[PDB]
Amino acid sequence: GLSDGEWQQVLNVWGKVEADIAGHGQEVLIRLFTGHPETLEKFDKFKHLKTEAEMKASEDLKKHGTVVLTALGGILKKKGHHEAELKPLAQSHATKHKIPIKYLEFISDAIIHVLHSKHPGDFGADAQGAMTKALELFRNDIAAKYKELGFQ
Numbered sequence: 520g521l522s523d524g525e526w527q528q529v530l531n532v533w534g535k536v537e538a539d540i541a542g543h544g545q546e547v548l549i550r551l552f553t554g555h556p557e558t559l560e561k562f563d564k565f566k567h568l569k570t571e572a573e574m575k576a577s578e579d580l581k582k583h584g585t586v587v588l589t590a591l592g593g594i595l596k597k598k599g600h601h602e603a604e605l606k607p608l609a610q611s612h613a614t615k616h617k618i619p620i621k622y623l624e625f626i627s628d629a630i631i632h633v634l635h636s637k638h639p640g641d642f643g644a645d646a647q648g649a650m651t652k653a654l655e656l657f658r659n660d661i662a663a664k665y666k667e668l669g670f671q
C-alpha cells in the first residue's frame with residue numbers, strides 16, 4: 520500500500536527508465552544474470568551467453584529487456600490497481616516458466632542497483648523508498664497467486 524506521494528515518486532523515477540527503456544532493460548537483465556547465474560538457466564534463448572560481453576552484444580537480450588520493463592511500467596502506472604495486468608504474468612511465470620519468487624526478489628534488487636548506477640546522486644532516499652515499496656507490492660501480489668497455484 521502506497522500513498523499518493525509515494526506513487527508520485529515511483530512514476531517520477533519511471534520517467535528516467537522510459538527515456539531509455541532498452542538500455543535500462545539490458546542492464547537490469549545483465550545484473551540479474553551475472554549476479555545470479557542460475558537465473559540464466561531459465562532462459563532457453565539466453566543460456567548460450569557465456570560472457571558478459573556476449574550479453575552486452577546481444578540484441579535479443581535488449582529486446583527482452585524492453586518487453587519486461589514495458590510490462591512492469593504498465594503495472595506501476597496502475598498505482599496498485601493491477602489485478603488484470605498481474606494475473607497473466609503470475610500464471611505464466613508459475614506454470615510455464617517456473618520462476619521461483621526468489622528470482623523476482625533478485626530482479627527487484629537489480630532494478631534498484633541499476634537506477635543508482637545510471638543515475639548516481641539522482642536517485643534519492645525518498646525515491647528509493649517508494650520504488651522499493653512498489654516492487655514489494657508487485658512481488659507480494661504475485662506471491663498470493665503462486666500460493667493459490669501451489670507453486671514453489
Ligand code: HEM
Binds near residue numbers: 558559608
Ligand atoms: C519485473 C519482473 C518481470 C516482468 C514484468 C516479466 C515480464 C515478462 C513478460 C511480459 C514476458 C513475456 C510474456 C509471458 O511469457 O508472460 C516474460 C517472459 C519470460 N519471463 Fe518474465 N518478467 C519478470 C521477471 C522474470 C524473472 C525474474 C525471470 C527469470 C529469472 C523471468 C523469466 C521469464 C522467461 C523465461 C520468459 C520467457 C522468455 C522467452 O523464452 O521468450 N521473468 N516475462
